Amino acid sequence: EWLQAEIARLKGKSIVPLQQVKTLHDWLDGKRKARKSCRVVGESRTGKTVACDAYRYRHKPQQEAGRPPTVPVVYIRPHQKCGPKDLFKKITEYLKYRVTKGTVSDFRDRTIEVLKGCGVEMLIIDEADRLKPETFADVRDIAEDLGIAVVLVGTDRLDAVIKRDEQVLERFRAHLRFGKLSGEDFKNTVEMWEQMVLKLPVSSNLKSKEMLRILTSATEGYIGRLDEILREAAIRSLSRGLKKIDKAVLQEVAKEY
Amino acid sequence: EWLQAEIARLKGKSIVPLQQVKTLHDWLDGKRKARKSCRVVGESRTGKTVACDAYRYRHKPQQEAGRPPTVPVVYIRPHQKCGPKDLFKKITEYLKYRVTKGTVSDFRDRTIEVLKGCGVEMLIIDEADRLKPETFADVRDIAEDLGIAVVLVGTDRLDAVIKRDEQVLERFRAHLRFGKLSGEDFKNTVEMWEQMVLKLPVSSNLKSKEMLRILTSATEGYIGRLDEILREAAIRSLSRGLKKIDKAVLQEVAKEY
Amino acid sequence: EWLQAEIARLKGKSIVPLQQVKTLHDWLDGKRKARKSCRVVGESRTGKTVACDAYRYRHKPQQEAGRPPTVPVVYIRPHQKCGPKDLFKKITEYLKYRVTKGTVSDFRDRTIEVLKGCGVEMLIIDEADRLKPETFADVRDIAEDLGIAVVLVGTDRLDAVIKRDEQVLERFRAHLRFGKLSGEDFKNTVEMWEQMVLKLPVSSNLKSKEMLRILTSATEGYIGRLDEILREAAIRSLSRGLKKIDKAVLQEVAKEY
Amino acid sequence: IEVWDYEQLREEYG
Amino acid sequence: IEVWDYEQLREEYG
Amino acid sequence: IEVWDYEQLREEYG
DNA sequence: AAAAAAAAAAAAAAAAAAA
DNA sequence: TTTTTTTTTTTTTTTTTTT
Ligand SMILES: Nc1ncnc2c1ncn2[C@@H]1O[C@H](COP(=O)(O)OP(=O)(O)NP(=O)(O)O)[C@@H](O)[C@H]1O
Ligand SMILES: Nc1ncnc2c1ncn2[C@@H]1O[C@H](COP(=O)(O)OP(=O)(O)NP(=O)(O)O)[C@@H](O)[C@H]1O
Ligand SMILES: Nc1ncnc2c1ncn2[C@@H]1O[C@H](COP(=O)(O)OP(=O)(O)NP(=O)(O)O)[C@@H](O)[C@H]1O
Ligand SMILES: [Mg+2]
């Protein structure tokens, strides 16, 4: 059935190359080879986590006949009120070692042994502000002791937390910021999304003045909103036997947000 | 009856050449001729014991008209909380001598006499962490006194035990590690197993995207899981008159684990 | 390749003699021979840890044919929320003795035995404020019982912690403070760094009014910032085929912080 | 412009 | 690629 | 003025 | 006639946020 | 000035088992 073949596709996930994404990859790579720590900030739906995954995936673990995987980039996300015992466990699991029972100093001594030997060049911490302040002592120590760049990713609250401590604010002084789309960039994106992602039999011509007004008001430049809304509109539209997104269906979806 | 002829086969055991296995054979052989001790570690279903058997079997005992068998490789597995009296008995039995009643020093003096004369070049100890700490004194002494390489095989707990004692950690410093399959290696293996082991009248084409997803999620790269699951699926499938493994039967089996 | 030979150098680390550094060495040495305890404070990027290493390295362990190394200066850095059991372990490792299992009183009795015999005259504790308050009892006792000067190194928070306890505040009353560079001192440093560290084929003349303004605003007198920024600018500049740092590249780097 | 399927990048992971 | 029957390797053992 | 290579001071350590 | 592995065990302790 | 409530350590004399 053609209709289900398509619905199964539209309801999926993909990464679209964008300027923000390319910028980050080049910036982080600069930083990785210079071994310097930094942070990335921006508003909650700009597509920060995804830009980071896109990067991780371009640098796969490497494997020889004998020794452990070489793992240039490690990516983790901490739980709420994450403590020092919790971070060593995730670093150790990520690199595929078994975590056994012991106390904090034992997880620490073990984390430094697996981080060594196994080439690790960069550590990326998502939602950085979930960390308890005491953990930052352990994060800085690693960044200083091992040639590992540490990148903190987060929202504007992160800076409110970071500026509470001079020592940390200084390790992580350099930053890159993600923001909203606008003007020509938002319009060209919309067009990309139509030709590169939706691909309906006829298509809708969403760069017309009438449709961009609807999308602009509905999405306010967040890539997260634009994606959800166009996909909810294409699958609704197909379920009803249409070959394109029109104004009434698009407004019908937009009014639900 | 064709059906039983086949079921009797699929329900059996075999050794498939794999890269991990070839690597170990060359590594151990290097070590054997240099007479150096070492250890092998890896996760519990990577196929360590089997790789070791495959090696043992390539070096059969040799026999002349008069003197005892020459036995280049000795392979043993200790019982739980194995003591010093228990090891000498297994070494002596393995080489086909009768064990008579006496005390520890008598089993020891006798073990060194049968280890001499009878050429023994390497001793492999499986499940090395079943040994009581006091036995390690006797293991090191043999490794130093006789030109015998001793190989300790085990899981990650082994290293937690070994690092408790400096003297042992140092005799057995060099190591090789087994791990999980992934990416191209897991996929090519799956294909090997289908053509080289299952051999159904039609076959299933398990390197297709749809089937690999099922197997990947079901097996997580352990060779032990992949083998059990494909064999349970081929015999179930034959019992039902099929000439290949389909998706519903494979999922039916996978959901039972 | 000339370009890589140079990049490998600029991306390294070195210690530049500075007035702050010389002052500390003479001050601490005074204190060492008088056996008095003291503390060192200053802002987080003034180069306190490095000044201390520069000192440690001028007093190497000494060795005779028989007895243990004589070790005039011991330098340690505690982990977060460091307890009494943790300090004895680091002191014992530092002096190259094996630490065995026991309880707190056993690490303590052993720490005093290795501190004796082995000449130790000064103990330097970096990041002093990571210590739990209960440890200070053990630190004072050592300072009083053995002819060992104890130096506490840290930031302004250290004093907020120290003034919580009269007994400690009094042992460690004397202090030296590190601060920012300014005026002629910052300008002469910049010049030192160019001739003594960067060494580009042509050089940039960074003591000119135009360049100092850029650096002053970018670095605010911290030696830690000045070093990072000039090195990031020299390697960026070389990668682009230049023989000196210009204004656009320097501003290009400064704007990233 | 090529677009990457998210699940693909994941299925192909080390 | 040849595959070895496990029981075979055992039955042929010294 | 002489400058010390950091790694040098370390490699030459007791 | 002497070594070895738990046995949980209940306190004991700051220690943080809100109102 | 007040109220939860939350995670971490620390030693700790007993009990049973065996060769
Ligand atoms: N190249 C891309 N292709 C497709 N979607 C993208 C792309 N970049 C961003 N997105 C959308 O971003 C949304 C995920 O947002 P997400 O990345 O979670 O926000 P964020 O950047 O993580 N900040 P936060 O979500 O607060 O952590 C998904 O809807 C993605 O489709
Ligand atoms: N090379 C191989 N060819 C075919 N089957 C294998 C191979 N290696 C292992 N197997 C099967 O996969 C499992 C191997 O298990 P096993 O070798 O016992 O794990 P291991 O390597 O011994 N680690 P452990 O079992 O914890 O000691 C068994 O089911 C084998 O039949
Ligand atoms: N004397 C120096 N010569 C050359 N570089 C220096 C010197 N002092 C500091 N630096 C550079 O600046 C950094 C010094 O910072 P550091 O020594 O870590 O200060 P700090 O004392 O650690 N402060 P804290 O945050 O309090 O640890 C190092 O990266 C050095 O390169
Ligand atoms: Mg420091």
Q: Show which subunits contact C, needing at least 3 CB pairs below 8 angstroms.
A: A, F
Work out the number of other CB atoms within 10 angstroms of the CB of residue B10.
18
> For chain B, what's the residue count?
257
Please give the number of the atom of ligand 3 that sits closest to the Cα of A171. 25
CA-CA distances (angstroms) from residue A257 to A222, A228, A253, B213? Answer: 14, 10, 7, 35
Q: What Å distances lie between residue A123 and A74, A149, C22, E3, CA to CA?
A: 5, 6, 37, 43
Ligand 2 pocket check for B160: Cβ under 6 Å? no
* The token pair that represents B71 in the structure block: 């036995």
C147 phi and psi, to 5 degrees?
-75, 65
Closest to E13 (Cα-Cα) out of B235, B57, A104 = B57
- Report CB contact under 8 Å: D12, B182: no
Pairing of the two strands A149-154 and A38-42: parallel
**Number of C-beta neighbours around residue C59 at 10 A:** 15
Q: Which helix (H) or strand (E) holds C22?
A: helix C19-34
Structure tokens, B207: 């390197």
Ligand nearest to the CA of A169: 3
**Which among B183, B213, B216 has the least Cβ separation from residue D14?**
B183
Chain H, protein-covered positions (CB within 7 A): 7-11, 19
Token look-up 């520890």 returns B104
3-class DSSP state of A208: coil
- At position C240, the amino acid (one-letter code) is R
CB-based contact C80:A142 (threshold 8 Å):
no
**Structure-token pair, residue B77:** 């597995």
Helix (H) or strand (E) holding C107: helix C104-115
Pocket test for ligand 3, best of C227, C229, C230 (most atoms within 8 A of CB): C227
- Between CA C249 and C1' G8 the distance (Å) reads 66
Torsion angle, alpha carbons of B69, B75, B81, B84, to 10: 30
Nearest to C237 by CA among C211, C209, C201, C212: C201
Cβ-Cβ contacts under 8 Å, C15 against chain F? 3-4, 6, 9
Residue with tokens 């029981």: E7
d(CA D5, CA C256): 33
Q: Which residues, other chains included, contact A247 with Cβ-Cβ below 8 Å and sequence gap of 6+?
A: A210, A211, A214
DSSP state of A195: I
Written in H, E and C, the secondary structure of chain E is CCCEEHHHHHHCCC
Could you report how far apart the first and last alpha carbons of chain F are, in Å?
A: 25
Write down the number of H helices and E strands in chain F: 1, 1
Beta strands in A60-108 (DSSP E): 73-76
The H or E element that residue A153 is part of is strand A149-154
In angstroms, the CA B228 to CA C169 distance is: 69
Pair C48, C27: CB distance under 8 Å: no
Residue A42 · residue A180 · CB < 8 Å: no
C85 sits within 7 Å of strand H by its CB: yes
CB contact under 8 A, A65 and B157: no
Sign of the Cα torsion C72, C77, C82, C85 reads negative
User: Which chains touch B (3+ CB pairs under 8 A)?
Assistant: A, D, E
Cα four-point dihedral sign B164, B166, B167, B170: positive
Distance C103 CA to G12 C1' (A): 19
Tokens standing for residue A95: 């690199």
Rounded-to-integer distance, Cα C217 and Cα C225, Å:
11
Tokens 């960074």 belong to residue: C206
| Chain A residues within 8 A of D14 when measuring between CB atoms | 60-63, 69, 71
Q: Give dist(CA C250, CA C223) in Å, integer.
A: 17
Name the strand (E) or helix (H) holding A175: strand A175-178
φ/ψ (deg, to 5) at A157: -65, -25
CB–CB of A13 and D6 under 8 A? Answer: yes
DSSP structural state of residue C149: E
Is the CB of C236 within 7 Å of strand H?
no
* DSSP H or E stretch at residue A49: helix A48-56
Kindly tell me the sign of the dihedral angle through the C-alpha atoms of B200, B206, B211, B212. Answer: positive
Contacts of E3 in chain B (CB under 8 A): 14-17, 196-197
Cα A158 to Cα A51, A103, A130, A149, A162, distances in angstroms: 18, 29, 9, 18, 6
Q: How far apart are CA C159 and CA C176, in angstroms?
A: 12
CB contact under 8 A, B180 and A96: yes
d(CA A58, CA A72): 10
Q: Do chains E and A touch (3 or more CB pairs under 8 A)?
A: no
- Could you give the CA distance from residue B206 to residue B188 in angstroms, rounded to a whole number? 10
Is the distance from the beta carbon of residue B44 to the nearest atom of ligand 2 less than 6 Å? Answer: yes
Are B149 and B36 in contact by the 8 Å Cβ rule? The answer is yes
Cβ of C103 < 7 Å from strand H? yes
Instruction: Dig out the tokens for C132 from the structure.
Output: 């739990």
C16 touching F (Cβ < 8 Å): yes
Q: Give B7: exposed, middle or buried? Use CB within 10 Å, 0-12, 13-18, 19+.
A: middle
Strand H, CB < 7 A, residues 114-173 of A: none
CATH among 3.40.50.2300, 3.40.1360.10, 3.20.20.70, 3.40.50.300 for B19-177:
3.40.50.300
Phi and psi, residue C103, nearest 5° = -110, -175
Residues of E in Cβ contact (< 8 Å) with B197: 3
User: Measuring CA to CA, how many Å separate B229 from each of B20, B42, B143, B213, B239?
Assistant: 21, 21, 41, 14, 16
| Residue B239 in tokens | 């019992």
**In angstroms, rounded to a whole number, what is the distance separating the alpha carbons of residues B215 and A93?**
22
Q: What is the dihedral of CA C204, C205, C210, C212, to 10 degrees?
A: 100
A174 touches strand H (CB under 7 A): no
With H, G, I as helix, E, B as strand and everything else as coil, classify residue C42: strand
A96 alpha-carbon distance from chain centroid: 22
Query: What is d(CA A96, CA A74) in angstroms, rounded to the nearest whole number?
Result: 11
Q: How far is the CA of B51 from the centre of ligand 2 (A)?
A: 8
Q: Are the C-beta atoms of A82 and A74 separated by less than 8 Å? A: no
- Cα nearest neighbour of A60 on chain B: B183
- In whole angstroms, G12 C1' to A141 CA is 31
State CA A140 to chain mean position distance.
22
Q: Using a CB-CB distance cutoff of 8 angstroms, which residues of chain E are in contact with residue B62?
A: 14
Cβ of residue B19 closer than 8 Å to a chain A Cβ: yes
Look at ligand 2, atom 12, and give the residue with the nearest C-alpha.
Answer: B224
Distance CA B31, CA B38 (A): 8
Interchain touch B–A (≥3 Cβ pairs closer than 8 Å) = yes
Q: Which residue of A has its CA nearest to C7?
A: A34
- How far B138 CA sits from the closest chain E CA (Å)? 28
Is the minimum distance from the CB of A227 to ligand 1 under 6 angstroms?
yes
Task: State the chains in contact with A (3 or more Cβ–Cβ pairs under 8 Å).
Answer: B, C, D
Separation CA B47–CA B193 (nearest Å):
15
Identify the bridge partners of residue A178 per DSSP, sorted by sequence position. Answer: A42
Looking at the partner chain, which of A60, A67, A98 has a beta carbon nearest the beta carbon of B177? A67
Neighbours of C232 (CB within 10 A): 23
Distances, alpha carbon B196 to alpha carbons B11, B239, C210, D13, in Å: 15, 21, 75, 26
Compute, in angstroms, the gap from residue C188 CA to the centroid of ligand 4: 24
Determine the Cα–Cα distance for residues A18 and A12; give it in Å rounded to an integer.
19
Q: Which two tokens stand for residue B86?
A: 């228990």
Relative orientation angle of helices A209-219 and A247-254, to the nearest 10 degrees: 10
Is B238 within 8 Å of B7 (Cβ atoms)?
A: yes
Q: How far is C168 from chain A (nearest CA, A)?
A: 24
Q: At residue C107, what are phi and psi to the nearest 5 degrees?
A: -65, -40
Tell me how crowded residue C233 is: count the other CB atoms within 10 A of its CB: 23
Nearest CA to C120 out of C61, C50, C49, C36 is that of: C61
Q: How far apart are CA C77 and CA C56, in angstroms?
A: 14
Taking CA atoms only, the protein residue closest to ligand 3 atom 11 is C224
Please name the residues in contact with D1: beta carbons below 8 A apart, sequence gap of 6 or more.
A16, A17, A192, A196
**For chain B, what is the HEC assignment?**
CHHHHHHHHHCCCEECCCHHHHHHHHHHHHHHHHCCCEEEEECCCCCHHHHHHHHHCCCCCECCCCCCCECCEEEECCCCCECHHHHHHHHHHHCCCCCCCCCHHHHHHHHHHHHCCCCCCEEEECCHHHECHHHHHHHHHHHHHCCCEEEEEECHHHHHHHCCCHHHHHHCCCEEEECCCCHHHHHHHHHHHHHHHHCCCCCCCCCCHHHHHHHHHHHCCCHHHHHHHHHHHHHHHHHCCCCCCCHHHHHHHHCCC
- Concatenated DSSP letters of C173-229: --EEEE----HHHHHHHHHHHIIIII--SS---TTSHHHHHHHHHHHTT-HHHHHHH
**Nearest residue, CB atoms, C130 vs list A105, A137, A170:** A137
**Method used to determine the 3D structure:** cryo-EM
- Interatomic distance C165 CA / H10 C1' (Å): 24
List the end-to-end C-alpha distance of chain E, in Å, as a whole number. Answer: 25
Token pair recorded at residue C245 = 């740092």
Residues near A199 by Cβ (< 8 Å), separated by ≥ 6?
A: none
Q: Strand H contacts (CB < 7 A) among B residues 65-124?
A: 83
Q: Which helix (H) or strand (E) holds C89?
A: helix C84-94
> Under DSSP, is residue A97 helix (H, G, I), strand (E, B) or coil?
coil
CA B35 to chain centroid: 21
DSSP state, C90?
H
Which residues touch A124 (CB under 8 Å, ≥6 apart)? A52, A56, A73, A74, A75, A76, A150, A151, A153
Give the three-class secondary structure for C44: coil
Residue A132 DSSP code: -
| Angstrom distance (rounded) from CA C78 to CA B96 | 58
Cβ C243 vs Cβ C202: under 8 Å: yes
Which run of H or E residues covers position A106? Answer: helix A104-115
The type of residue at C255 is K
CB B51 within 8 A of CB B44: no
- Region for C221 from its dihedrals, namely left if φ exceeds 0, alpha if ψ lies in -120 to 50, beta otherwise: left
Say if CB C51 and CB C164 are below 8 A apart. Answer: no
CA–CA gap between residue B38 and residue B124 (Å, rounded): 10
Q: Could you give the CA distance from residue C190 to residue C206 in angstroms, rounded to a whole number?
A: 7
